[PDB]
Amino acid sequence: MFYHISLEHEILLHPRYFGPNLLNTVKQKLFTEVEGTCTGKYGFVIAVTTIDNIGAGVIQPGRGFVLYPVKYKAIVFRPFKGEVVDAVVTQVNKVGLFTEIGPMSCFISRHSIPSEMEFDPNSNPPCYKTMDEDIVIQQDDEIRLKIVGTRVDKNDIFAIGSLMDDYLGLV
């Protein structure tokens, strides 16, 4: 879920960018660095809400760079196991289902898929359909899925969706 938190980052500014627009330069560099990145413990940083406080620029001995610590309010998506989430199904295959939550990709395995659902390969849209067709899971649909577990590997979170609980799936 999106959470508006103050985080810390470090910037080793090179002397070539010194002079006028120094504060603009460190602001731009923090924007370039944090945006579009994922961290395992803190999830997906979405965007810089703002840069709160610019720390003192400690000139590195022996190196020449200047180290700036920066406090910044940023919003982070952190998935929660044991929570229901609205998700957009991206890819549907016979093995499982992939869904998008923000930039993050979650999965619904062949068995985490409910047994009532069954793949429909013969039809023109490849989709999982129930016998009564009260819920039909295809690509590009809004589903309520329970997060079984936030399985994190190398600065990227992939969760597992489940429809075992009632009232889940399409609206």
Partner: protein, 471 residues
């Protein structure tokens, strides 16, 4: 009673020392120099020293005098403690044997025929020989043609053969050896030896349940382990006390959606996650592949490491390179430029990879290694892979989703899209410039200048190549 005193003796010659001292006792039992010691003990498995029974250390010293073998214990002796006197004498303890001596020491040997004479038994063995080529070794099958070709001491009766010190062989060595020269109890060969010719495994951290008893259905994490009666110390759910269970009362139970590794069997080494816990058929899916793997509960352990699941460039021949796609016991599965998977020996050559090599895709875009490229033409059209190796007109693409050859395939580069100077060491003569007259040898050479070690003076200097004239 008298006390035992330790006397250091020559290693491997204790029983001979005891025999000599008994002979000395009998040879001086009636003389004016009687041996006042009572007995001598030279245990079989205690090597290096012996024991002498006497009431005094002076008796020991005066008795062992004249025995060179005990001279290292002559000056001083140590009494065996009174409470440990029992332990001096306390002694403990189509098949397969293992020969003791010879080059076949501790080698599995199948008892072919047991001679009723009780002197030797016929044993089948694998020869550890060089076939008289190095001497003037590991186990390998007995090659009859090689030892016939090399000659020497060799006699042929078809598959039957005599060679190199009356070694008898047939099709495999078949030679007689004394039972005292082998071990006839406690070999227990492995399955590999059979091809050539219950168990408990509880680990700390693993979760186990209770299958029977008053403490049934209590899942807890293992802390300790022992051999048979473990008396385990499991940390149960909602219980701060530590209870006791043997190996037989537990089972390797695991909740769904947790890391699992296989300890043994056809699925050994593969990791994954268990899905549904049936009575005994536990179904899981690997981190590599998405195939059903059914295992017993005992064939699972709780280990949180990532799966291993490498990819080195090798030369099948100077005309075609190869990329290893699987590592095996004695061979490499190598995927070449043609797309043909081959199986080759360990002794291909490692080529110097050129990581800065430049290749052109199908749209005249420069592409380097680690670049994600889509295949728009060729047999693998539609796939998208990361470049790992390059050729003049081929590129090798890795893809984790593709379960074939470890995800590695190959496509032509034009069907992708990005998503020493001769003058060195030559005697020369300065024909122009201030250094004219002299002779030197060219150490370093360039396009313009060249270093010359000057023969005449104790220095080296650089001169234009125009100033040089070879001898």
């Amino acid at each position: 009673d008298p006390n035992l005193w330790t006397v250091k003796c020559k290693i491997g010659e204790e029983r001979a020392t005891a025999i000599s001292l008994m002979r000395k006792f009998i040879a001086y039992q009636f003389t004016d120099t009687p041996l006042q010691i009572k007995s001598v003990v030279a245990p079989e498995h205690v090597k290096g020293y012996i024991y002498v029974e006497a009431y005094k250390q002076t008796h020991v010293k005066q008795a062992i005098e004249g025995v060179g073998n005990l001279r290292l214990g002559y000056w001083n002796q140590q009494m065996v403690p009174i409470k440990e006197m029992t332990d001096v004498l306390k002694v403990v303890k189509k098949s397969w044997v293992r020969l003791k001596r010879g080059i076949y020491k501790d080698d599995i040997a199948q008892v072919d025929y047991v001679e009723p004479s009780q002197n030797t038994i016929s044993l089948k063995m694998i020869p550890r020989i060089d076939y008289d080529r190095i001497k003037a070794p590991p186990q390998r099958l007995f090659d009859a043609e090689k030892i016939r070709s090399l000659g020497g001491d060799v006699a042929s009766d078809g598959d039957f053969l005599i060679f190199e010190g009356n070694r008898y062989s047939r099709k495999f060595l078949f030679k007689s050896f004394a039972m005292s020269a082998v071990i006839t109890e406690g070999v227990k060969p492995t399955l590999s030896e059979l091809e050539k010719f219950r168990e408990h495994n509880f680990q700390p951290g693993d979760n186990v349940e209770v299958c029977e008893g008053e403490l049934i259905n209590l899942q807890g994490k293992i802390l300790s382990v022992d051999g048979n009666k473990i008396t385990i110390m499991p940390k149960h759910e909602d219980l701060k006390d530590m209870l006791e269970f043997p190996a037989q009362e537990l089972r390797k139970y695991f909740k769904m959606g947790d890391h699992v590794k296989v300890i043994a069997g056809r699925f050994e080494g593969d990791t994954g996650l268990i899905v549904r816990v049936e009575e005994n058929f536990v179904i899981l899916f690997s981190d590599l592949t998405m195939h059903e793997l059914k295992v017993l509960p005992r064939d699972l352990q709780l280990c949180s490491e990532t799966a291993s699941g490498w990819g080195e460039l090798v030369q099948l021949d100077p005309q075609t390179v190869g990329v290893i796609v699987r590592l095996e016991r004695e061979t490499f599965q190598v995927l070449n430029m043609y797309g043909k998977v081959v199986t080759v020996r360990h002794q291909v050559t490692r080529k110097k990879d050129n990581r800065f090599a430049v290749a052109l895709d199908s749209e005249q875009n420069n592409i380097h290694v680690k670049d994600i490229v889509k295949v728009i033409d060729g047999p693998h059209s539609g796939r998208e892979g990361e470049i790992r190796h390059l050729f003049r007109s081929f590129a090798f693409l890795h893809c984790k989703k593709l379960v074939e050859n470890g995800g590695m395939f190959v496509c032509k580069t034009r069907h992708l899209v990005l998503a020493d100077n001769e003058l060195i060491g030559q005697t020369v003569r300065i024909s122009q410039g201030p250094y004219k007259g002299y002779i030197g040898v060219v150490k370093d050479a360039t396009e313009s200048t060249a270093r010359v070690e000057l023969h005449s003076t104790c220095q080296t200097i650089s001169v234009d190549r125009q100033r040089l004239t070879t001898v």
